[PDB]
Amino acid sequence: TFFHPKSREDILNEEAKIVQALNNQRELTIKMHELKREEKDYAHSYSPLFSDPVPQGGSIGKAPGSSRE
């Protein structure tokens, strides 16, 4: 009579909830390992404001014919 255990069903549901959360952490971990080591944008990596990488040089003797694409 003093034996008052939790039922089989509630036990199985609790273990299932635990395993579900562990699988959620697994997917989050993989997804972040993938989000890192993914190529970013230049603005996120170097310069948000001057996002044009292209280097403009000096101006004291700017020769027409020195720009190129």
Binding site: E39, Y42, D52, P53, V54, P55, Q56, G57, G58, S59, I60, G61, K62, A63, S66, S67, R68, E69
Partner: protein, 68 residues
Amino acid sequence: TAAGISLTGGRNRCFSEWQSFMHCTAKTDAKSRAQCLPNFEDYMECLHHTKEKARLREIESVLKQKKE
């Protein structure tokens, strides 16, 4: 920060090819970055002048042994 500037305060000698290469880097992502090879090779040729030097070595060889 002081890149692409000459001794007179202007654009250097090899700036233009560097500009084309930097343009094509901005156009491409790391997977498509292979397209920037000939631009980079042109930059290195302007800098170090190797392929033109070897061209002239071939010309000089023809002036050197095939005549004497």
